[PDB]
Amino acid sequence: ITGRPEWIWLALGTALMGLGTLYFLVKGMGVSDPDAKKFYAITTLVPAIAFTMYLSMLLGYGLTMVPFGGEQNPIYWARYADWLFTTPLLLLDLALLVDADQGTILALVGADGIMIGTGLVGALTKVYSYRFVWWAISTAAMLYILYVLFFGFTSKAESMRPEVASTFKVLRNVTVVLWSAYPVVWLIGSEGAGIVPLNIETLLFMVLDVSAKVGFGLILLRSRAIFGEAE
Amino acid sequence: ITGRPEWIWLALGTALMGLGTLYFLVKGMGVSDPDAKKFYAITTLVPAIAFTMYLSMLLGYGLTMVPFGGEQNPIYWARYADWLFTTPLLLLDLALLVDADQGTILALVGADGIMIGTGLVGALTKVYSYRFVWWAISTAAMLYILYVLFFGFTSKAESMRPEVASTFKVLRNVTVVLWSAYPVVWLIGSEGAGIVPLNIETLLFMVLDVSAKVGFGLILLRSRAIFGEAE
Amino acid sequence: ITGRPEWIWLALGTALMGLGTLYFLVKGMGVSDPDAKKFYAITTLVPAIAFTMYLSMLLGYGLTMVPFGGEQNPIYWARYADWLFTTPLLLLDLALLVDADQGTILALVGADGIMIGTGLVGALTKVYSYRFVWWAISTAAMLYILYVLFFGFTSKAESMRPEVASTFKVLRNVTVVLWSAYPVVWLIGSEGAGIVPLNIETLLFMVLDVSAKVGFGLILLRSRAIFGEAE
Ligand SMILES: CC(C)CCC[C@@H](C)CCC[C@@H](C)CCC[C@@H](C)CCOC[C@@H](CO)OCC[C@H](C)CCC[C@H](C)CCC[C@H](C)CCCC(C)C
Ligand SMILES: CC(C)CCC[C@@H](C)CCC[C@@H](C)CCC[C@@H](C)CCOC[C@@H](CO)OCC[C@H](C)CCC[C@H](C)CCC[C@H](C)CCCC(C)C
Ligand SMILES: CC(C)CCC[C@@H](C)CCC[C@@H](C)CCC[C@@H](C)CCOC[C@@H](CO)OCC[C@H](C)CCC[C@H](C)CCC[C@H](C)CCCC(C)C
Ligand SMILES: *C/C=C(C)/C=C/C=C(C)/C=C/C1=C(C)CCCC1(C)C
Ligand SMILES: *C/C=C(C)/C=C/C=C(C)/C=C/C1=C(C)CCCC1(C)C
Ligand SMILES: *C/C=C(C)/C=C/C=C(C)/C=C/C1=C(C)CCCC1(C)C
Ligand SMILES: CCCCCCCCCCCCCCC
Ligand SMILES: CCCCCCCCCCCCCCC
Ligand SMILES: CCCCCCCCCCCCCCC
Ligand SMILES: CCCCCCCCCCCCCC
Ligand SMILES: CCCCCCCCCCCCCC
Ligand SMILES: CCCCCCCCCCCCCC
Ligand SMILES: CCCCCCCCCCCCC
Ligand SMILES: CCCCCCCCCCCCC
Ligand SMILES: CCCCCCCCCCCCC
Ligand SMILES: CCCCCCCCCCC
Ligand SMILES: CCCCCCCCCCC
Ligand SMILES: CCCCCCCCCCC
Ligand SMILES: CCCCCCCCCCC
Ligand SMILES: CCCCCCCCCC
Ligand SMILES: CCCCCCCCCC
Ligand SMILES: CCCCCCCCCC
Ligand SMILES: CCCCCCCCC
Ligand SMILES: CCCCCCCCC
Ligand SMILES: CCCCCCCCC
Ligand SMILES: CCCCCCCC
Ligand SMILES: CCCCCCCC
Ligand SMILES: CCCCCCCC
Ligand SMILES: CCCCCCCC
Ligand SMILES: CCCCCCCC
Ligand SMILES: CCCCCCCC
Ligand SMILES: CCCCCCCC
Ligand SMILES: CCCCCCCC
Ligand SMILES: CCCCCCCC
Numbered sequence: 001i002t003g004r005p006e007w008i009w010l011a012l013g014t015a016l017m018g019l020g021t022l023y024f025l026v027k028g029m030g031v032s033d034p035d036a037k038k039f040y041a042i043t044t045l046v047p048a049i050a051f052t053m054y055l056s057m058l059l060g061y062g063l064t065m066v067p068f069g070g071e072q073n074p075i076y077w078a079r080y081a082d083w084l085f086t087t088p089l090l091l092l093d094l095a096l097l098v099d100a101d102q103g104t105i106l107a108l109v110g111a112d113g114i115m116i117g118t119g120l121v122g123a124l125t126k127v128y129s130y131r132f133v134w135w136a137i138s139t140a141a142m143l144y145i146l147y148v149l150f151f152g153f154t155s156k157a158e159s160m161r162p163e164v165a166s167t168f169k170v171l172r173n174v175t176v177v178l179w180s181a182y183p184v185v186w187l188i189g190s191e192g193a194g195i196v197p198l199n200i201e202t203l204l205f206m207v208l209d210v211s212a213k214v215g216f217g218l219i220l221l222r223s224r225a226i227f228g229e230a231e
Numbered sequence: 232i233t234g235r236p237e238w239i240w241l242a243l244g245t246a247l248m249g250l251g252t253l254y255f256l257v258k259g260m261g262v263s264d265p266d267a268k269k270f271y272a273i274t275t276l277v278p279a280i281a282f283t284m285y286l287s288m289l290l291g292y293g294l295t296m297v298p299f300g301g302e303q304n305p306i307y308w309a310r311y312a313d314w315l316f317t318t319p320l321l322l323l324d325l326a327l328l329v330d331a332d333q334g335t336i337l338a339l340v341g342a343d344g345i346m347i348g349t350g351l352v353g354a355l356t357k358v359y360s361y362r363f364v365w366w367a368i369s370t371a372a373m374l375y376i377l378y379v380l381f382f383g384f385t386s387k388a389e390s391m392r393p394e395v396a397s398t399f400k401v402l403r404n405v406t407v408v409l410w411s412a413y414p415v416v417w418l419i420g421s422e423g424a425g426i427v428p429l430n431i432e433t434l435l436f437m438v439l440d441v442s443a444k445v446g447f448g449l450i451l452l453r454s455r456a457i458f459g460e461a462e
Numbered sequence: 463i464t465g466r467p468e469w470i471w472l473a474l475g476t477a478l479m480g481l482g483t484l485y486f487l488v489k490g491m492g493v494s495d496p497d498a499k500k501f502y503a504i505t506t507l508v509p510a511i512a513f514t515m516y517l518s519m520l521l522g523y524g525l526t527m528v529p530f531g532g533e534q535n536p537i538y539w540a541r542y543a544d545w546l547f548t549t550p551l552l553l554l555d556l557a558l559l560v561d562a563d564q565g566t567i568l569a570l571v572g573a574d575g576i577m578i579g580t581g582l583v584g585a586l587t588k589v590y591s592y593r594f595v596w597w598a599i600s601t602a603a604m605l606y607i608l609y610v611l612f613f614g615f616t617s618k619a620e621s622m623r624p625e626v627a628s629t630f631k632v633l634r635n636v637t638v639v640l641w642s643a644y645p646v647v648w649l650i651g652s653e654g655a656g657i658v659p660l661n662i663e664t665l666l667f668m669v670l671d672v673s674a675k676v677g678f679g680l681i682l683l684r685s686r687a688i689f690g691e692a693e
Pocket of ligand 26: 019022023026027
């Protein structure tokens with residue numbers, strides 16, 4: 001395990017996701033409100049899935065070698081397995097907060113699936129120049145998602161409770177900033193142009209992942225917006 | 232890319248799915264009705280997914296070699312990845328049109344999953360005679376789906392709005408004819424008996440795919456059946 | 463096929479799932495009640511999926527070799543493909559019976575996904591001692607599911623119809639006993655410590671699978687709890 005310099009960040013990531021999972025699990029024990037239960041379920045599952053995939057990367061299972069540029073390049077494929085399930089759960093948290101219509105939710109989840117799926121294909125593609133074609137398609141799917149979060153959701157939040165409108169606005173802003181960093185790190189890291197070494201890349205993704213999951217969850221689950229308006 | 236004679240049909244397929252995706256995306260921009268949004272979301276996602284998988288076939292990612300009959304046989308596995316997601320979306324379009332009950336929808340999607348999954352296993356099976364066992368099981372799942380579309384849905388459409396009944400009937404008929412061709416092409420093509428060469432097989436699937444997705448979508452999204460009855 | 467001593471149990475399993483599938487399919491033909499249709503759909507799909515995966519194991523497709531302990535160890539990976547889809551369907555049968563809230567259903571299905579997914583990783587892991595780390599995480603996800611079935615569902619059933627409360631209690635008890643055997647068989651069988659040989663392991667899983675699917679389904683589909691209260 002320690003044979004890879006990036007192991008320290010995989011281990012820290014595993015620990016922080018594990019701790020985040022346990023914290024949300026305990027916190028949600030005292031919850032009976034049916035609406036709050038939905039948000040706790042979604043939000044606890046996110047770091048639990050990430051915990052398993054960080055562990056698989058730490059132990060070496062979630063790593064494969066991909067030939068491109070005349071080299072055997074270490075590619076952590078387990079990231080995409082994580083993201084396939086956790087990024088639509090994160091979007092679902094946002095969509096339920098603002099009572100999004102079903103068509104909009106399906107558009108978001110579908111675009112998200114395309115985003116992660118094409119990122120996976122790009123990560124595993126052996127023809128170097130083609131990796132960036134997949135990156136571009138994935139990034140276009142991301143831009144669609146960000147567009148919807150701003151010009152379909154923000155003006156939906158404003159007709160809702162003030163506490164859900166303010167909580168949505170904060171989580172929207174956190175999401176757009178954090179999620180936009182992922183394609184940049186991929187592009188300059190070992191999957192793309194290879195300018196930033198894998199150990200630093202792994203650190204960067206770990207900070208983004210913990211912030212986008214445990215950070216996000218801490219903000220959401222401390223808000224009164226997750227509860228039905230009750231006396 | 233041009234090293235494979237079937238590349239021209241993969242390229243045309245990619246282009247037509249891409250163009251179809253953009254057309255539906257633009258067309259649905261001016262839509263606020265919650266019901267119509269569902270149909271636009273579902274129907275736009277279908278060629279978008281197909282676009283990505285056609286591209287993966289064009290670039291060579293979605294192709295593998297399978298030993299059977301003492302030969303290395305080129306198998307485009309990306310078709311099944313496409314179909315796994317797009318065929319239940321197509322069925323969902325039909326089921327929502329007639330306000331199908333939840334049990335019926337689950338039966339359809341489940342049978343569809345079995346249909347595509349067993350087709351994939353058959354496509355990748357190395358014992359030649361066993362490929363046709365999987366083809367038979369998949370075809371039985373197809374026949375179940377077609378049965379339900381006729382003797383569970385058609386008489387559901389007739390108690391609904393005339394515009395939804397007439398639109399459903401047309402899309403049902405398009406679906407049954409087009410979908411029934413797929414097992415025949417598989418059986419006589421490079422996956423099955425090998426009587427029709429891969430380049431012609433690829434052409435045939437491209438015509439079926441564009442018709443079943445973009446053709447289907449053009450009929451559906453031009454109907455007033457996708458809108459709630461409103462003043 | 464007969465080259466593997468466990469083939470007889472794979473063949474019997476295939477037959478019993480096939481027969482169970484046909485029986486439930488015929489039985490549900492005379493059903494119009496929308497609630498009952500849901501239970502028939504879910505419950506018929508379960509042995510149908512299991513039939514396909516038992517067949518893939520019989521024909522040899524669903525088997526791979528995994529190096530650990532200095533040996534090539536036969537691992538039937540198709541079990542996890544089965545279980546990935548059938549165990550959440552089984553939980554859905556239980557959850558719908560007691561009209562579980564959406565948050566609880568998502569927690570169950572999510573924990574179940576983690577349970578099966580980590581079992582799959584453990585089954586395919588090449589470092590022997592690490593296989594048991596994945597077994598432990600999977601078992602913890604199982605224990606969560608069993609906890610919810612007892613201390614979240616049982617007291618939900620009691621405020622419902624007596625026929626649904628009594629049917630739920632029986633199916634809950636069947637589920638907890640049968641499902642708890644699976645991690646034990648894995649641990650002592652060819653995936654784990656290797657004390658029980660593969661042919662006996664295969665027998666054990668076949669008895670558990672038929673009981674947990676066809677047995678379970680026979681109890682559920684003969685109950686009046688699956689019908690809406692109607693005059
Ligand atoms: C509604 C939304 C969910 C829409 C989803 C959007 C989605 C369509 C976007 C594209 C997804 C698609 C790229 C998934 C591809 C998975 C694939 C990378 C798995 C690895 O297999 C690739 C090659 C080795 O590189 O296998 C070597 C050759 C092997 C023989 C491969 C044969 C097995 C195939 C992988 C079977 C395909 C199954 C499905 C792709 C399962 C989807 C997995 C998940 C990653 C989407
Ligand atoms: C409700 C509905 C959805 C019901 C669904 C119906 C469904 C049950 C029908 C059968 C689906 C099942 C056949 C999927 C099999 C996928 C498999 C072909 C992927 C390729 O792996 C096959 C061999 C190489 O040929 O791998 C070589 C050996 C490797 C070590 C394989 C180990 C990895 C396994 C593939 C893990 C299994 C994961 C699940 C099958 C994911 C499902 C993928 C999708 C195609 C259904
Ligand atoms: C809401 C709930 C559903 C939550 C779900 C919980 C879930 C997160 C729990 C963990 C699931 C995760 C372990 C699935 C891993 C599948 C993996 C074993 C498939 C086989 O690939 C493993 C190695 C060979 O051993 O591939 C060799 C290297 C290859 C290059 C691998 C590259 C292809 C990757 C497999 C692509 C990943 C796609 C997704 C994992 C699809 C999920 C399949 C299913 C088994 C969950
Ligand atoms: C918890 C993990 C999260 C929130 C991950 C988010 C990841 C993305 C938004 C990834 C986006 C990518 C692209 C837009 C193109 C390049 C490849 C990706 C997959 C890194
Ligand atoms: C957009 C793509 C569509 C509508 C594809 C439909 C495909 C089928 C109905 C495929 C059916 C098959 C069988 C019935 C058995 C042989 C294998 C298949 C998968 C080709
Ligand atoms: C129809 C099949 C059923 C009901 C299978 C149930 C399987 C399980 C509950 C498996 C549990 C496992 C663990 C808890 C850890 C070890 C690995 C598994 C996957 C066997
Ligand atoms: C969105 C953030 C992307 C920028 C990442 C900056 C990383 C700077 C680290 C120094 C680069 C290491 C190069 C020498 C090894
Ligand atoms: C459902 C349509 C299946 C029939 C396809 C007919 C294809 C005819 C093309 C000629 C066959 C090529 C054989 C000589 C290369
Ligand atoms: C939950 C049941 C697990 C116990 C399984 C008992 C199997 C006993 C069979 C005898 C073991 C075979 C060892 C000699 C080959
Ligand atoms: C490819 C995996 C996509 C599914 C991820 C799980 C999250 C799905 C959330 C469903 C949202 C509800 C839509 C109506
Ligand atoms: C194996 C992939 C199956 C899922 C495909 C996505 C479409 C699912 C549509 C869900 C229909 C709603 C059922 C209640
Ligand atoms: C990884 C596969 C998980 C999906 C299995 C299919 C069963 C899903 C049942 C959905 C229950 C409804 C939740 C709201
Ligand atoms: C186009 C929608 C406006 C809100 C999205 C902001 C786009 C940020 C760009 C992210 C950088 C990705 C490379
Ligand atoms: C049995 C249901 C009647 C409607 C379905 C028509 C079946 C068409 C056969 C398709 C050919 C597949 C090989
Ligand atoms: C902790 C919840 C109480 C009900 C679950 C009973 C646990 C049975 C243990 C199963 C054995 C697995 C190794
Ligand atoms: C070796 C790099 C070749 C450049 C490929 C860039 C493709 C980016 C596509 C953006 C439309
Ligand atoms: C080499 C071909 C052997 C014939 C197999 C046909 C099987 C079809 C099954 C239909 C019930
Ligand atoms: C070779 C076996 C080494 C023992 C591993 C047991 C790990 C079990 C983890 C339970 C917390
Ligand atoms: C990680 C295993 C958890 C089993 C005990 C249940 C914890 C309490 C959860 C309350 C919903
Ligand atoms: C509760 C702490 C969980 C941390 C387990 C994984 C950390 C890796 C240590 C090497
Ligand atoms: C908008 C046109 C999209 C076409 C891109 C793929 C066509 C392949 C050209 C070689
Ligand atoms: C209807 C009987 C189904 C049995 C088919 C599979 C049994 C395997 C026989 C070798
Ligand atoms: C993006 C950083 C999130 C910070 C989380 C802090 C949570 C405290 C309530
Ligand atoms: C099956 C062929 C479909 C033809 C689509 C034409 C759409 C015009 C409205
Ligand atoms: C766990 C054993 C189940 C027994 C099923 C018998 C069904 C008869 C109604
Ligand atoms: C990591 C366990 C958290 C302890 C409880 C925190 C207050 C709910
Ligand atoms: C008003 C919300 C500001 C949140 C910005 C957080 C940036 C990481
Ligand atoms: C809305 C601001 C987006 C900031 C992008 C930051 C990418 C590192
Ligand atoms: C391909 C872009 C379509 C242009 C608009 C067509 C009329 C909505
Ligand atoms: C009355 C509907 C006829 C549609 C037939 C289309 C055949 C491709
Ligand atoms: C309902 C008519 C079906 C026609 C099947 C055509 C197969 C090529
Ligand atoms: C296996 C076929 C079952 C025959 C009908 C049983 C009574 C519904
Ligand atoms: C009162 C229900 C008892 C069911 C026990 C079944 C054990 C297999
Ligand atoms: C509730 C009793 C569980 C029995 C476990 C049996 C495991 C073989």
